[PDB]
Structures are given as C-alpha cells and as structure tokens.
Amino acid sequence: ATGGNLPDVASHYPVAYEQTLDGTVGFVIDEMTPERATASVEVTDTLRQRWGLVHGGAYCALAEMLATEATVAVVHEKGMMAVGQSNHTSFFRPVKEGHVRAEAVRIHAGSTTWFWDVSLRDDAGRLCAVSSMSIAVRPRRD
Amino acid sequence: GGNLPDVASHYPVAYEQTLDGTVGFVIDEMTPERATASVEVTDTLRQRWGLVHGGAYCALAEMLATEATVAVVHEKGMMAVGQSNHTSFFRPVKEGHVRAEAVRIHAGSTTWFWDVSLRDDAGRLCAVSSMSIAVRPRRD
Amino acid sequence: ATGGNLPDVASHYPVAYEQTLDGTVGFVIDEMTPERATASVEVTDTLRQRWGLVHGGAYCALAEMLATEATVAVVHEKGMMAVGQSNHTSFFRPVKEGHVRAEAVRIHAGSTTWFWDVSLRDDAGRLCAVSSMSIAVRPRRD
Amino acid sequence: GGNLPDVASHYPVAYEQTLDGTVGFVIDEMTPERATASVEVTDTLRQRWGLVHGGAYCALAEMLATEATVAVVHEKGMMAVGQSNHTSFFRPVKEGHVRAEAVRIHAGSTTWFWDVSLRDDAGRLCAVSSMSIAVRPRRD
Numbered sequence: 034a035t036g037g038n039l040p041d042v043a044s045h046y047p048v049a050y051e052q053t054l055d056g057t058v059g060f061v062i063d064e065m066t067p068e069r070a071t072a073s074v075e076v077t078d079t080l081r082q083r084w085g086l087v088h089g090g091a092y093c094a095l096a097e098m099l100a101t102e103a104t105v106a107v108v109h110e111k112g113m114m115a116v117g118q119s120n121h122t123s124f125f126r127p128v129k130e131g132h133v134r135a136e137a138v139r140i141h142a143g144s145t146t147w148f149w150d151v152s153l154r155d156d157a158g159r160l161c162a163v164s165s166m167s168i169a170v171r172p173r174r175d
Numbered sequence: 176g177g178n179l180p181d182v183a184s185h186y187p188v189a190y191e192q193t194l195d196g197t198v199g200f201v202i203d204e205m206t207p208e209r210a211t212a213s214v215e216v217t218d219t220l221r222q223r224w225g226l227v228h229g230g231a232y233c234a235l236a237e238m239l240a241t242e243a244t245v246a247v248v249h250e251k252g253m254m255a256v257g258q259s260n261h262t263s264f265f266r267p268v269k270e271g272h273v274r275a276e277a278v279r280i281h282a283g284s285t286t287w288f289w290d291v292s293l294r295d296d297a298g299r300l301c302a303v304s305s306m307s308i309a310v311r312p313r314r315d
Numbered sequence: 316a317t318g319g320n321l322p323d324v325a326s327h328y329p330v331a332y333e334q335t336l337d338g339t340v341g342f343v344i345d346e347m348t349p350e351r352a353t354a355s356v357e358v359t360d361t362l363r364q365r366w367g368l369v370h371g372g373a374y375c376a377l378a379e380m381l382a383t384e385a386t387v388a389v390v391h392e393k394g395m396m397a398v399g400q401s402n403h404t405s406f407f408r409p410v411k412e413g414h415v416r417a418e419a420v421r422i423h424a425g426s427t428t429w430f431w432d433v434s435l436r437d438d439a440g441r442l443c444a445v446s447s448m449s450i451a452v453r454p455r456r457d
Numbered sequence: 458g459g460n461l462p463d464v465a466s467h468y469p470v471a472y473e474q475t476l477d478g479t480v481g482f483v484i485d486e487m488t489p490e491r492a493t494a495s496v497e498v499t500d501t502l503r504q505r506w507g508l509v510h511g512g513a514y515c516a517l518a519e520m521l522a523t524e525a526t527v528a529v530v531h532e533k534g535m536m537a538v539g540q541s542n543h544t545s546f547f548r549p550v551k552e553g554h555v556r557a558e559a560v561r562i563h564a565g566s567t568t569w570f571w572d573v574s575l576r577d578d579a580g581r582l583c584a585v586s587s588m589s590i591a592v593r594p595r596r597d
C-alpha cells in the first residue's frame with residue numbers, strides 16, 4: 034500500500050507488508066509509472082547469504098516484486114491479475130554492502146504478457162545484476 | 176542450521192541471520208549430483224497477495240544449486256557463485272511447503288549447471304529454475 | 316507434414332518444408348507424443364558457423380521447432396494455435412560434426428502455456444546443450 | 458561476406474556455406490560496445506506456418522553478440538563462444554526484414570553479456586535476446 038510504497042489498488046491485502054518477504058528484507062518502491070519503476074533496499078544480513086554477499090535470490094525477488102507490482106499498478110483497475118511467469122536474473126558483480134537499487138523498464142505490454150528489463154545497481158552505480166521479467170496478465174478469478 | 180555444507184571454519188554471516196535462515200530454508204540431501212531442500216510456507220515467504228513470493232523460489236534454487244557446487248569444489252580451492260538463474264512459474268503456492276530438488280546436468284571446469292524443480296505439498300510442479308553456477312579459483 | 320515428419324494437422328501449409336529453415340538445415344522429427352518428442356539433424360556446413368562448430372542458433376531452432384510442433388500436435392485439432400514465447404538455450408559443449416539429437420520432455424501443460432525441456436546431444440550421447448522452451452497456446456484467429 | 462570481423466587468416470567454414478550465409482545475415486555496424494546486423498526475410502528464414510522461425514532470431518542474436526566479442530578479444534589471444542541465449546518472442550514477423558541491435562552491458566574477464574533487440578520493418582520490437590558469451594584463453 035505504502036509500507037514499502039507498493040501500489041494502492043485494493044482496500045485490503047491478504048498479507049501485511051511488514052510481514053511479507055518484501056517487508057521483511059525492506060524493499061521500497063521509489064518511482065512508479067506504466068513504463069518504468071524503481072525500488073531499493075538497504076543491504077543487511079537479512080539480504081545476504083552465509084558468504085557475506087547479497088543473496089542471488091534477493092536480486093530476483095526485488096526484480097520480481099517490482100515488475101509485477103508495476104504491472105499491477107496499471108491492470109488491477111482494469112480487472113486483471115498480474116503474476117510473475119518467468120524471471121531470468123544474471124549476476125555480473127556481487128554486492129557486499131550499501132544498497133541495491135533496481136530499475137525496471139517496460140519493454141513489451143501485450144494483452145497476456147508484459148515484459149520488463151530490470152537493472153540492479155550498487156551504490157557506486159555499477160551494474161551488478163539484470164533480470165528479464167515476464168509478467169502474465171490474466172482476468173481476476175475474483 | 177540449514178544443514179548447509181560444512182566446508183569452512185568461519186562464515187561471514189550466521190545462518191540464522193542470512194536470508195536463508197530468515198525464511199527458513201533447510202537442506203535435506205546433498206551429493207555431488209543431486210540435492211534437496213525445503214521450507215515451510217510462512218508470511219515471511221509470501222508477497223502481499225498471499226502467495227509464495229516468486230523470489231522465494233529463485234532464492235531456494237540459488238542457495239541449493241550453489242551450495243551443492245560449493246560442497247564439491249570448496250575443498251579444491253575453488254569458489255562457486257550463482258551466475259544465472261532462470262525460474263519459470265507454473266502454479267502458485269499459497270501455504271504448506273515448497274520442496275526443491277536440484278539435479279546436476281553439467282559439471283564444467285568453469286560452470287556447473289543444475290535443473291531445480293520446486294513442488295508443493297501435493298507434489299505438483301509449481302516452478303522450475305535453471306541455475307548456472309560459476310566456478311573460480313579462490314582469491315587470496 | 317512428413318518432409319521432416321512434422322505433425323500433419325492441416326491440409327495445407329504456408330511454406331513447404333523443403334523451403335523452410337527446418338527443411339533447409341534438415342531437421343527431422345523422429346518420435347512424437349503429447350509428453351515427449353524427438354528429432355535430429357545431420358551436421359553439415361549449413362548448420363555450422365565460420366569457426367567450424369554447430370551454430371548456437373541451430374540448437375535453439377531445433378529445440379524451438381520441436382517443442383512447438385509437439386504442442387501443435389495436440390492443440391491444433393482443439394482449435395488452438397501454438398507459438399514459441401521464450402527459448403533459453405545453454406551451451407555446455409560444442410558439436411563439430413555428426414548429428415545433433417534433441418529430446419523434448421513436456422514438464423507443464425497449462426491452459427495458456429506449455430513448457431518443455433529439451434536436451435541436445437552429440438553422437439557420443441554427450442549433453443552439448445539444453446533449451447527451456449515456453450510455448451504460448453492461444454485460440455486461432457483463423 | 459556477412460561483414461564479420463576479419464580477425465583471422467583462415468576460417469574453417471566459408472561464410473556462404475555457414476548457417477549465417479545460408480539465411481543471409483549481414484553485420485552492419487560493429488564497435489566494442491554495440492553492433493548491428495540484419496537479414497531479409499525469405500522462406501529460408503521461416504517455419505512452415507509462414508512466420509520467421511524463432512530459431513532465426515536466436516541465431517542472429519547469437520552470431521551478432523558472439524562476433525562482436527570476438528572482434529575485441531581475438532587479438533588478445535582469447536576465444537569467444539555463446540554460453541547462454543535467452544530469446545523472448547513478442548510479435549511475429551511474416552516478411553520484410555529482421556534487424557538486430559546488440560548492446561554490451563557487461564564485459565567481464567570470463568563473460569560478456571549483451572542485450573539484443575530484434576525489430577521488424579516498422580521498427581516494432583518483435584523479440585529480445587539476452588546473450589551470455591564465454592571468453593576463454595585460446596587453446597594451442
């Protein structure tokens with residue numbers, strides 16, 4: 034809703050932000066438009082793996098929530114549902130501390146699938162990882 | 176804690192504090208060619224819509240495939256890290272557990288590849304992850 | 316139809332097998348069931364790149380045609396259309412000569428998307444490449 | 458022929474005989490960080506249903522990203538080969554041309570990554586390919 038600043042498209046949500054994975058690791062959406070969205074997270078141990086680096090899953094999740102929610106922002110009101118269907122994240126350079134900043138750019142908005150390219154950077158602006166997200170858009174059963 | 180491979184004397188982050196320990200991932204079996212892990216679904220593993228977070232599946236696969244590689248290569252002076260993770264989602268999971276099984280399909284000198292299958296309590300294939308693990312010589 | 320032994324689901328096809336990319340490089344389907352299909356191709360220069368190895372695109376194409384056609388075999392008659400939506404091929408070992416043998420195993424058959432894992436092997440049975448194929452199934456406009 | 462980088466005295470397969478030369482791929486621009494190529498749609502590039510073969514897009518991207526890497530690294534004693542190719546299809550192409558543009562996003566010591574965009578004659582994004590290129594020291 035606003036806990037992590039996610040899009041307010043519903044009156045009630047099944048799980049409260051603070052309690053979700055997102056709330057737990059502290060993902061926060063910064064900008065959000067139909068074609069582009071941004072989010073970030075402060076690196077803490079909760080975001081890392083045992084070796085001291087940001088967990089690969091963390092980048093995937095950030096990209097996942099971002100691209101999906103960005104789709105949700107537009108289609109919800111149109112009676113649709115949006116869920117992640119494919120997430121392909123590639124790791125270029127590890128992140129040990131600071132933040133992870135994600136930028137999602139929409140590259141295709143089909144009737145059934147939206148596609149977003151997500152770039153994940155470190156505090157120095159280096160490209161640490163990228164995620165190609167494919168979002169399925171379907172009519173709500175609800 | 177998570178039953179991760181014990182390959183070193185000290186780890187920078189304690190299990191309980193890692194993302195793995197936070198969501199509750201636990202390794203069940205581990206061999207050079209195959210490994211398994213699972214996690215109980217809690218809200219910590221879900222997104223606001225009540226379903227298991229796509230990131231959760233990615234994370235499980237990533238840790239499982241990477242650690243299964245570390246298990247073999249660590250003792251050989253090598254480091255193993257995730258290079259690519261491609262997860263595809265077939266059916267959501269609302270509660271119960273997520274169980275992963277990683278099958279090694281290629282063990283190259285510089286890259287290992289694992290196919291990970293993620294299933295629900297009914298044994299249904301909910302998602303798959305194709306994991307590419309980079310293997311490199313440890314730096315001083 | 317049978318030129319490359321593709322599934323006979325229509326009376327007429329827009330392009331004749333021998334003239335398509337498939338016919339050109341010589342892809343031939345061997346077995347074909349709803350859950351699993353196989354195909355092969357003899358390596359010739361037409362399948363290679365300038366460095367003398369089987370072109371990465373060749374593996375992608377073989378996987379692509381196979382997984383799609385295998386879906387087509389079942390859904391066509393059901394009034395659907397099937398096209399490749401995502402193809403992720405990973406290369407483990409190059410192939411210089413002989414054949415490339417592909418085996419597609421269906422792992423998920425949703426209402427809108429089917430997913431097949433394709434393994435591409437050399438004459439010695441080695442796993443040279445794999446392709447994760449996502450096939451979109453939609454109702455024919457035709 | 459295809460305007461591929463001239464980096465060596467002899468090539469095992471002549472351009473015209475390769476898959477590239479057979480379908481008609483031609484490199485247009487090439488720099489270390491970006492390259493372009495295109496091809497005229499012919500039946501040789503299509504599948505039986507009359508659309509450009511998904512494999513055609515994969516192939517174009519693969520050759521373009523790989524050769525753009527070879528262009529830089531060959532002279533450095535390295536070999537470049539495709540390691541992973543992930544192509545996603547957004548809109549089919551029935552005739553005309555397919556134009557590709559490869560943008561380098563990471564140039565690591567062992568892996569280079571390129572984003573390839575494939576467009577039709579109307580400039581519409583028909584498909585994308587995420588190419589991972591392995592860079593290794595040449596073998597004797």
Ligand SMILES: CC(C)(COP(=O)(O)OP(=O)(O)OC[C@H]1O[C@@H](n2cnc3c(N)ncnc32)[C@H](O)[C@@H]1OP(=O)(O)O)[C@@H](O)C(=O)NCCC(=O)NCCSCC(=O)c1ccc(O)cc1
Binds near residue numbers: 142397454
């Ligand atoms: C995959 C998908 C159907 C998904 O639909 P979407 O992402 O939601 O996009 P959307 O529904 O908004 O429509 C996009 C365009 O797709 C096409 N399309 C979508 N639905 C349909 C349909 N039911 N019937 C025909 N065309 C359709 C159409 O061109 C449409 O544009 P428009 O007519 O609406 O202006 C669409 O993105 C698409 O068609 N991508 C192109 C797929 C493609 O060309 N794959 C490669 C060729 S097929 C695989 C292959 O290589 C092969 C080789 C040999 C062989 O024997 C068989 C197959």
Ligand SMILES: CC(C)(COP(=O)(O)OP(=O)(O)OC[C@H]1O[C@@H](n2cnc3c(N)ncnc32)[C@H](O)[C@@H]1OP(=O)(O)O)[C@@H](O)C(=O)NCCC(=O)NCCSCC(=O)c1ccc(O)cc1
Binds near residue numbers: 282283536538
């Ligand atoms: C990518 C990689 C180098 C990664 O190495 P890895 O996963 O750690 O595996 P590993 O290093 O243990 O070696 C596996 C095999 O790869 C080959 N290989 C690995 N490193 C090397 C090297 N430095 N030099 C030569 N061969 C090598 C070799 O065949 C080796 O087998 P072996 O002789 O050691 O028994 C290896 O898996 C591989 O070579 N995969 C095959 C790559 C391939 O064939 N891609 C498609 C063709 S190249 C892309 C293309 O389509 C293209 C098209 C047109 C054009 O103009 C240019 C390019």
Ligand SMILES: CC(C)(COP(=O)(O)OP(=O)(O)OC[C@H]1O[C@@H](n2cnc3c(N)ncnc32)[C@H](O)[C@@H]1OP(=O)(O)O)[C@@H](O)C(=O)NCCC(=O)NCCSCC(=O)c1ccc(O)cc1
Binds near residue numbers: 174266268427
């Ligand atoms: C993607 C897709 C909709 C494609 O449909 P399909 O491949 O053709 O399969 P099919 O239509 O036959 O149905 C499969 C199952 O999907 C579900 N499903 C399909 N269509 C719908 C729909 N319109 N409404 C609800 N559930 C549906 C349902 O569980 C269905 O089973 P059943 O009720 O028919 O027995 C389906 O495969 C699926 O739902 N996969 C699971 C998607 C998923 O769980 N992604 C991860 C969670 S959402 C992304 C995320 O992490 C996130 C995080 C934070 C945040 O704030 C927002 C999002």
Ligand SMILES: CC(C)(COP(=O)(O)OP(=O)(O)OC[C@H]1O[C@@H](n2cnc3c(N)ncnc32)[C@H](O)[C@@H]1OP(=O)(O)O)[C@@H](O)C(=O)NCCC(=O)NCCSCC(=O)c1ccc(O)cc1
Binds near residue numbers: 125126127255564566
């Ligand atoms: C994959 C690869 C090693 C490939 O190397 P490359 O593409 O050729 O790039 P390059 O070799 O030039 O080096 C780039 C950076 O990678 C790092 N790196 C590369 N090789 C090494 C090495 N042998 N030792 C240490 N760092 C290295 C290093 O940070 C380097 O920067 P620099 O110090 O040289 O300036 C590099 O891109 C990389 O390290 N990517 C980051 C990998 C990553 O962070 N994956 C996610 C975390 S590990 C997977 C995971 O989530 C997990 C979770 C739980 C668990 O229990 C275990 C694992």
Ligand SMILES: [Cl-]
Binds near residue numbers: 035036038039050
């Ligand atoms: Cl929120």
Ligand SMILES: [Cl-]
Binds near residue numbers: 068139140
């Ligand atoms: Cl767009």
Ligand SMILES: [Cl-]
Binds near residue numbers: 178179190
């Ligand atoms: Cl542990």
Ligand SMILES: [Cl-]
Binds near residue numbers: 208279282
């Ligand atoms: Cl293996």
Ligand SMILES: [Cl-]
Binds near residue numbers: 317318320321332
């Ligand atoms: Cl045929």
Ligand SMILES: [Cl-]
Binds near residue numbers: 423
């Ligand atoms: Cl199945």
Ligand SMILES: [Cl-]
Binds near residue numbers: 459460461
């Ligand atoms: Cl040439």
Ligand SMILES: [Cl-]
Binds near residue numbers: 563
């Ligand atoms: Cl770059």
